[PDB]
A paper describes a structure:
Unlike other members of this family, and unique to membrane proteins, prestin functions as a voltage-driven motor with rapid kinetics, likely providing cycle-by-cycle amplification of sound within the mammalian organ of Corti2,3. For members of this diverse family, known structures are dimers with each protomer showing a common 7 + 7 inverted-repeat topology containing a core and gate domain; these proteins function variably as coupled transporters and uncoupled transporters/ion channels with a range of substrates.
Here, we use cryo-electron microscopy to determine prestin’s structure at 3.6 Å resolution. Each prestin protomer comprises 14 transmembrane helices (named TM1–TM14), a C-terminal cytosolic STAS domain, and a short cytosolic N-terminal region. Seven of the transmembrane segments (TMs 1–4, TMs 8–11), are referred to as the “core” domain and the remaining seven helices (TMs 5–7, TMs 12–14) form the “gate” domain of the structure. The N terminus of one protomer (residues 13–75) crosses over the STAS domain (residues 505–726) of the opposing protomer so that the interface between the STAS domain and the N terminus of the opposing subunit is the largest in the dimeric assembly and buries a surface area of approximately 1438 Å2 (19% of contacts). In contrast to the previously reported SLC26a9 cryo-EM structures, the cryo-EM density for the IVS loop resolved in the prestin structure shows a more ordered, interpretable density. The angle between TM8 and TM14 helices of prestin and of Slc26a9 is 57° (for prestin), 61° (for Slc26a9, the intermediate conformation), and 67° (for Slc26a9, the “inward-facing”, open conformation). We speculate that our cryo-EM prestin conformation, showing a narrower opening to the cytosol, would explain why this protein shows reduced ability to transport anions in comparison with Slc26a9. Despite purification in high chloride, we were unable to resolve a density corresponding to a chloride ion within prestin. We reason that our prestin conformation solved by cryo-EM represents the contracted state of the protein at 0 mV.
Numbering used by the authors:
A (entry chain A), B (entry chain B): 13 to 158, 165 to 580, 614 to 726
The structure:
Amino acid sequence: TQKYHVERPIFSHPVLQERLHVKDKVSESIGDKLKQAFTCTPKKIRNIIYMFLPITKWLPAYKFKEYVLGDLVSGISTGVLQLPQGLAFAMLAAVPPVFGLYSSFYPVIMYCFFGTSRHISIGPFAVISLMIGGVAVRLVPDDIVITNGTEARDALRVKVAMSVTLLSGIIQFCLGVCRFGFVAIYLTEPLVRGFTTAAAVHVFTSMLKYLFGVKTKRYSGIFSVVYSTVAVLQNVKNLNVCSLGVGLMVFGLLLGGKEFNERFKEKLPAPIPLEFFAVVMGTGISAGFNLHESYSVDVVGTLPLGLLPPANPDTSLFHLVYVDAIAIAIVGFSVTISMAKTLANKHGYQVDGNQELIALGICNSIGSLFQTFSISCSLSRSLVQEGTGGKTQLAGCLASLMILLVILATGFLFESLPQAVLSAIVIVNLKGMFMQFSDLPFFWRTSKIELTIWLTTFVSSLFLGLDYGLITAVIIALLTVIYRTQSPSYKVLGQLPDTDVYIDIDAYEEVKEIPGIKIFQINAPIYYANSDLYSNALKRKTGVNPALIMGARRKAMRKYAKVKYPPIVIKTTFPEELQRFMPQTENVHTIILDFTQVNFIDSVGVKTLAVMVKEYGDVGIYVYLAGCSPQVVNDLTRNRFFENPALKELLFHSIHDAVLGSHVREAMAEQEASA
Amino acid sequence: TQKYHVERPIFSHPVLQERLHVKDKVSESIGDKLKQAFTCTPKKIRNIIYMFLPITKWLPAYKFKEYVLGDLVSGISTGVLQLPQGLAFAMLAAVPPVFGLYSSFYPVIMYCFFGTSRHISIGPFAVISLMIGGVAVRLVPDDIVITNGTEARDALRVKVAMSVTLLSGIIQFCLGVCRFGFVAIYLTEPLVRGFTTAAAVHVFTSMLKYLFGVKTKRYSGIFSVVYSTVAVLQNVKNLNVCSLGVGLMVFGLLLGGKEFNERFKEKLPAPIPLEFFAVVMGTGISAGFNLHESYSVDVVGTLPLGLLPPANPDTSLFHLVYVDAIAIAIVGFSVTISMAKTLANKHGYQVDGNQELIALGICNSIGSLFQTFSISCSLSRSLVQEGTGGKTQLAGCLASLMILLVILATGFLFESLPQAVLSAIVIVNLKGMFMQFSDLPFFWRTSKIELTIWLTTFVSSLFLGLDYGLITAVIIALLTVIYRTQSPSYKVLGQLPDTDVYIDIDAYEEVKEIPGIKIFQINAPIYYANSDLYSNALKRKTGVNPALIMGARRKAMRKYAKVKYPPIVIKTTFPEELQRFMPQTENVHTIILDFTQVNFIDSVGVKTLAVMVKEYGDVGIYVYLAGCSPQVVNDLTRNRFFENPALKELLFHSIHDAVLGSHVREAMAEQEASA
């Protein structure tokens, strides 16, 4: 074997630098980058087309042998779940459900043409629908001045909804083309899991009132979940029993069917789309028993059979829906990129945030001309597509084809459909995300920092609106790194004999401390927020406090009473007469602070290091720096730390190098004192 | 000399760990900390008294020999500047100036008894006065229903001012006693410099309208500076010429006097208090020439001579001044701790944020009973106290004594005092902070990160209210560390022969790369926000892209066409027949990623590292980890990275250790292939 044997001299900073020569520093200029990426080679243009327009990329990669059956099953299940869930979001958004039908067909195909993620399901989303409904209510109130019909009111509501949807689409496209979308590098896996869980709880609390069959005022904004829950709880007295009863029966039936599908996962060739049987039996019972006026239950109502021509929305209303459209676009992009990243990490591939944002923005912008409200990623549909075995985006295309087949022919069958059934089917297909709470014990016993980031994201995202909840979750997520820096290892370390290794004294029982040597290590980049903490930790853990040493020297003195710079370290001037009565200690001649684990030095860090070196020299203690990175040396010579040229020799390439240099200097001092 | 000579075996993780034994892990329990700090020794109680009540600490340390003359001069100058500046803040706060006189005497003495900083000047501050005036206007408008006097209106204004001041004092005390104040570890030196500069510009723009002798509506809140400047500019047409003229003459006189004092700093024994001569000549000219009705200029008015008894403020109004008092307390504490830290770093000592907050809160709370509005640190007075040679807080006591001597006897002399003179003297004594702009070129050519943090703090603190401006300046200040992490060194490094040193290949011209070895180093803690960046940088800079290698192998294949886990690294299975037509490269057998510079590993980092190792093994490339810190090894074994026990041997204590281990494994493989 090749034994670890090296014979080199000491490599402090001056003696190492005198053996090295500076580069020629090859020219890396702005013009060199500028002329590149403009030659317009066929490969470059093909790559640009592939990145911007990805449908032409993976269609030749599609394989008929092993993808067709899975894609067909996934598309069938996606359409089956997309019908009533889309209707539910539509009737939640204070618009007729036919507009939800439009918003379930065009955007999916447009995202298939332009989107990157191949496993998420695109369509209407809950909190987007709540925002749209709140905007429409704020513009067009419940009572407006135009028998006693509401067609004009619904027309005004859909006009303002289309206006805010188009504004959100344009601003999303503008953000995407302006290279915004790098923030997808944020949104940590606990963070996105907590965000999706909070969104799920928001959907549950939003559709709880629709399950109960009670109509109340809609709440949008901060503290929306608690206000909605209070509104539901205050109106439980005014309740209908038959709608709640049928909702509970369909709830139990769907829960039993899902448990049966999970229990018999090995037996059936594919999971049967029980969500279609559920809705068809629900509408059959509603039509047969005629609950719409016998019990006066809420019904989704008549469904037009049309494919209305494109229309230009109302631009003039953009002036009042600035912040609303901004919030809608931010939340939609965040949810879409969150679910895309989650599914990509689940499978193994990757998604592009910029491409997702551009595709979503242009999709919303074009679909707004098609009388469709704002879209996002449907989390429940995305998980069920992942579970059933989705592999491509053509499952969404099949879902859109099924939606179209319903619209043109089957649309009049759902006129007698209770909204409680839609609410309950949304809850049962959303119950699959409440199993994402299983990471809480997965994070408690394992990396509690992920636990607290998950809790912070979930709390700030549930009890507060998503548009500010996610930005504050990201803020505390990134300040978590700051906190982790502010609590370093702070370990004093020695060495075990006849080795280069230097390990914590409280680690392994044979790393004997070198007598007279104290080595302090920090696992932090020692910037302003922890420079004083580092100084205090060094003064405490190593047991060498310069202020305490000076105080002890002064009290011993009073007890016994009855350009050229000065040297950094002054020798002890107290004679043996005064030194007879002293609190004698180990009297370490040097302390070395290795900088192998630091990343950079801040200006406050430079000042703290300089004053530390000055204080220890005033006491009479040499201070050496071990293993400073070239960036750290650059940050030191950047400031006025190296104004005194007699500080370049306090720098050492390694801890062992610093220890050996201290030993050599001690031997030289002893030889000079003797000889 | 002691040459660096070591003879030790290879120290990969298993062979190193088998030579070490785990601790007994001495008991560090909660109860051990709990019983400590409750024995109530005389030293402990004395230290608690010293920390909470510091006036008893440094009074015995006061020396009559070298402090008396400097303290007397500093106190004289502080009182001289405190008189008209305090009057100006009072008449800006929509309250009679006598209340500013009260707010210039009691709080200074109370802070002397309780405050820690020994060089800052305590009194009224501008933006605090703007907030108080805005609150008083919002509660009591300009036109209220109670000849045609305003004494009742002024009484209501001072009542609401005292109420909000007391609320700010109580909440400041509550924050201080609740150990809040650790945020003083933030507020970097560029950040506090920019904050003070923005505050100075706010004072200038606020008192510009008072210099012009025009009365407009007061603006408080976000974008206050631009609104105030627009209000001043729109009313330059409605102007008086005599007040502006006398303001310009006193401006020029004070500028000339300050330049003369600076030019003759060596000659005079002490800088003469020209601010007293200025105000006395101004009020003498105002009384003699009688401008109050000849030119109808603004006059500070009659000044009562009283020491009014303590009164209880209006508690019931607390319900409406929540956010206002919160902002006032936050801004006051921030300014005080900022100037305290700046002066402490200028001199060398340190200040306690918690003690400063407690002292300020209790000072404001008690002084609110004395008909005084909210206080803070006066920046201009603090700098002039620092410059004149302040050493103790008794200079503030002398300033308060001078203010009292003015109140009881000399108070009726300032009845005929134009407000333009007060505005101009504030500007001339505030011009000393506009020299703090000199750090902009000190930061451009030196550590541009400090430049951008300074610019961010100044912009967010000037063009936006201080209460949110400072919190957002802190937010971007702490995200600056995140950005600095997201742009690591990203250097591929080799070694120079016969040494342990490993240095960047683009550094010094003799660090020859070991053939078949690629070493990648990151100066970042490789968490979620830069894991993908690290992977891309490794795949790009080292020229080894596993996806590209697999693609090249597949294209060569198509060209030539006409629990027990599997081993991590699979041997190349392509025969020599297919290997004849290949894009042959260096074919590095290993790549080693040293973790000496990283601080921790995130869960996303663990996943990225695992998938990286898997991909490189699939290609057939060994991956080793060099110099992982014990925290990094703990973070790796924390996750499921070490589920496969054949990954513990990819860990090495040093880069040279990993290189030698790779060499030994290559030699063993060659020996096995041959023999």
